[PDB]
Amino acid sequence: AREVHIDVNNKTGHTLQLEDKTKLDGGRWRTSPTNVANDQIKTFVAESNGFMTGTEGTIYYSINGEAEISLYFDNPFAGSNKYDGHSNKSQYEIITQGGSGNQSHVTYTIQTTSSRYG
């Protein structure tokens, strides 16, 4: 019973549309991902359900015909948890901070990309 709690914080300027391709490679959804409104935070939760396995998956969101977001999480059996957030268009950026442990928590902040000085 490893669990992964997921906060998705939408700061994109648009609605995050959940894509059907969203998938759990291991485990099950206690609370499953939904669309998330601009300037909104929602929490989704996944449960590991077997012997010496863990929870692992990727949530995919669409930014209104404009871009694809991928949020990966892994709370393995033994090991370090792993997480990543990626945007297929340079105009969006994901901040990823997630927990260590067993009942773990990760927050993905989907934001507008900033321009770096000089």
Side-chain angles (χ1 to χ4, degrees):
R2 311 267 138 194
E3 340 163 44
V4 181
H5 296 246
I6 298 152
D7 277 33
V8 176
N9 190 358
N10 183 181
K11 312 299 292 184
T12 61
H14 318 277
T15 286
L16 284 179
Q17 310 178 331
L18 185 65
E19 300 180 339
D20 290 334
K21 64 198 218 162
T22 279
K23 182 165 87 158
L24 289 183
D25 309 286
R28 42 191 199 181
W29 288 118
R30 209 196 264 174
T31 294
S32 51
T34 80
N35 291 325
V36 343
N38 188 230
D39 297 323
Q40 163 175 97
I41 303 168
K42 283 228 256 222
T43 301
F44 308 128
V45 197
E47 290 163 336
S48 140
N49 69 3
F51 197 42
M52 298 190 69
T53 47
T55 291
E56 170 187 23
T58 304
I59 301 173
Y60 296 97
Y61 285 109
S62 176
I63 300 171
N64 72 2
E66 187 196 4
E68 204 185 46
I69 309 293
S70 312
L71 315 169
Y72 171 78
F73 55 86
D74 188 22
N75 194 323
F77 169 43
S80 306
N81 291 321
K82 286 197 260 193
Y83 316 86
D84 211 9
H86 169 98
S87 168
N88 75 335
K89 294 260 171 145
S90 63
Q91 346 179 325
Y92 301 98
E93 212 198 284
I94 295 91
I95 305 185
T96 297
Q97 69 210 2
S100 26
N102 191 359
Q103 289 175 286
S104 76
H105 219 111
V106 54
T107 295
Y108 303 102
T109 297
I110 329 305
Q111 64 187 11
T112 248
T113 174
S114 287
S115 104
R116 194 165 260 112
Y117 187 72

